[PDB]
Design a binder for this molecule. Structure first.
Ligand SMILES: [Zn+2]
Lengths: 131, 4
């Protein structure tokens, strides 16, 4: 479903950078991107495949260029065929890589939230250490 | 763009 450029392109119905820019909904959706606007970062877009999240876009940001630059190890980036031209096998291996990519982003978020808490814990324990 |  998200593998379809057209499921993706439909998420940008309120995306700022339109015709005239480089990160147009089309060049974005074609680069694996999906529009995930939060109240504070309304231009936040996320790769449907590697789940990296990029904000603060700029009129001449190349969705593909930014993609390679921040998530170089993304498999979707290396797919050179059109979608319909993927073997069922290729599509399975792609979809399995994706599940692995979702497990990874989640782990990162779990570890990140954990370190944020631990630092706050370590710091309060230092205070005691002094006395 | 930058990392969120
Ligand atoms: Zn990606």
């Amino acid at each position: 479903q998200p593998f379809l450029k057209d499921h993706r392109i439909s998420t940008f119905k309120n995306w700022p950078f339109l015709e005239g820019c480089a990160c147009t909904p089309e060049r974005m959706a074609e680069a694996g991107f999906i529009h995930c606007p939060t109240e504070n970062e309304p231009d936040l877009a996320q790769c449907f495949f590697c789940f990296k999240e990029l904000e603060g876009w700029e009129p001449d940001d190349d969705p593909i260029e930014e993609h390679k630059k921040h998530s170089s190890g993304c498999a979707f980036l290396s797919v050179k065929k059109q979608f319909e031209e993927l073997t069922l096998g290729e599509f399975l291996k792609l979809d399995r890589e994706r599940a692995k990519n979702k497990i990874a982003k989640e782990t990162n978020n779990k570890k990140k939230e954990f370190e944020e808490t631990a630092k706050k814990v370590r710091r309060a324990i230092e205070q005691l250490a002094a006395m | 763009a930058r990392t969120k």
